[PDB]
Amino acid sequence: SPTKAIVRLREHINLLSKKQSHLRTQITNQENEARIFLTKGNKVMAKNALKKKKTIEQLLSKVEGTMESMEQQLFSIESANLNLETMRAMQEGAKAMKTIHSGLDIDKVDETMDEIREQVELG
């Protein structure tokens, strides 16, 4: 069911979201270590810290990408659902109007009967 899917996608995004914040935190921490090392020490350590930071960034980009794909799917479903609603309503409105086209124009008992009568008589 569509409702089931929407819930899964939303919950899934939530999880990815939790991960995104964690990843962001790691990125800042690593950058900070790089800053202090540049002071209380050797570059090499700083360079190493930055490289780590980059790989944490690339992983984040992927987390973000999965989220982006998921978000797109939600939009496509939410959009599709609306269209269905439009179609049903449009379908419903046609039925209502049909009952109207009937009205008393078709509810002409004499016209119908005579027609039936002639065919009987016609044999």
Numbering used by the authors: 18 to 140
In the authors' words:
The endosomal sorting complexes required for transport (ESCRTs) are membrane remodeling machinery that mediate diverse fundamental cellular processes, including the biogenesis of multivesicular body (MVB) during receptor down-regulation, enveloped virus budding, cytokinesis, plasma membrane repair, nuclear pore complex assembly, and nuclear envelope reformation. Vps20 nucleates the homo-oligomerization of the most abundant ESCRT-III subunit, Snf7, which then recruits Vps24 and Vps2. We then crystallized and solved X-ray crystal structures of Snf7core in two conformations at 1.6 Å and 2.4 Å resolutions, respectively.
The angle of the flexible loop between α3 and α4 also changes, which enables α4 to position in different orientations relative to the α1-3 hairpin. Although both structures exhibit an open conformation, we noted two different orientations of α4 with respect to the α1/2 hairpin. In open conformation A, α4 extends in the protofilament plane, whereas in open conformation B, α4 is positioned perpendicular to the protofilament plane. Superimposing the two conformations revealed that α4 can rotate by at least ~90° along the axis of the α2/3 helix. Despite the large differences in α4 positioning, α4 makes a similar interaction with the α1/2 hairpin of a Snf7 protomer in a neighboring protofilament in both structures. The L121P mutant exhibited a MVB sorting efficiency of 32%, compared to that of the α1/2 loop residue Asn59 mutant N59P of 75%, suggesting that the α3/4 loop functions as an important flexible 'hinge' that may facilitate different architectural stages of Snf7 polymers.
